[PDB]
């Protein structure tokens, strides 16, 4: 659809979802505790405002939290040319006040296998003439693909820190404005929305940063900052 094959969902359903705002919504993120957010490294900008408890990013419904980012820490081996290690930490200036629309997502203990179904969320929408923009909060269930089939879709491009999720027939995907947001598999954060060849195209599934490779880096980075 206009929601890239997904379904609409609310901030109660995905309370760990956040918006990154620099005058407009450019990326998503996930809340991993009261003060910290995980996003994609290519989402790095200066002067990010984090918006939590959002149902509509265009309308202030009186139940959202707007918190400035105090610190943004991009993985030290992030390569913008290959998108490898596409993961960033954001420290909020103050702690979020946690409630039904605002809560944090657990980090994985093990990696997810092929065929595990996950939930991908974000504000990425697509208009008619294939033109993508943020608006409605949408959700999508998608499987994790085998590494074979992912490398077969993007030959030479897939590193050990990426996985593919989605449907080889297309129609359902994440798209521009979804970058940095959550892929949650059985209550754990297993992915971050990273890249793809277009959106919801046949034989071109979305490509996500594999968060299980990073759990120690994340935990030690948070703890020393």
């Amino acid at each position: 659809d206009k929601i890239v094959g997904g379904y609409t969902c609310g901030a109660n359903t995905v309370p760990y979802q956040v918006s990154l705002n620099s005058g407009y919504h450019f990326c998503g993120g996930s809340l991993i505790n009261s003060q910290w957010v995980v996003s994609a490294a290519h989402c790095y900008k200066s002067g990010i405002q984090v918006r939590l408890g959002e149902d509509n990013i265009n309308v202030v419904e009186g139940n959202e939290q707007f918190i400035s980012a105090s610190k943004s820490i991009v993985h030290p081996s992030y390569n913008s040319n290959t998108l490898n290690n596409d993961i960033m930490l954001i420290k909020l200036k103050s702690a979020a006040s946690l409630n039904s629309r605002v809560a944090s997502i657990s980090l994985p203990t093990s990696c997810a296998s092929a065929g595990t179904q996950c939930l991908i969320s974000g504000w990425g929408n697509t208009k008619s003439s294939g033109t993508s923009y943020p608006d409605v909060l949408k959700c999508l269930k998608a499987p994790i693909l085998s590494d074979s089939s992912c490398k077969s879709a993007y030959p030479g491009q897939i590193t050990s820190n990426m996985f593919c999720a989605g449907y080889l027939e297309g129609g359902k995907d994440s798209c521009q404005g979804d970058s940095g947001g959550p892929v949650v598999c059985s209550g754990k954060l297993q992915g971050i929305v990273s890249w793809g060849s277009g959106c919801a195209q046949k034989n071109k599934p979305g490509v996500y940063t594999k968060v299980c490779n990073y759990v120690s880096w994340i935990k030690q980075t948070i703890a020393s900052n």
Binding site: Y24, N81, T82, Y133, W195
Partner: protein
């Protein structure tokens, strides 16, 4: 063409990042990011340039 800024797109992947960082084509289309305008161009025999940053 009625120009004034190319897209500088040096990606080593055959895909674009899913960030919303719009640019206004000289054609009058809003491209959700510069990488998208790039990939769109490469299947064109006449490149659209960037009229302004932000949506048209």
């Amino acid at each position: 063409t009625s120009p004034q800024r190319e897209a500088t797109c040096t990606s080593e992947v055959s895909g674009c990042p899913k960030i919303y960082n719009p640019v206004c084509g000289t054609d009058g289309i809003t491209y959700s990011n510069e990488c998208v305008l790039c990939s769109e161009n490469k299947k064109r025999q006449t490149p659209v340039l960037i009229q302004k940053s932000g949506p048209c």
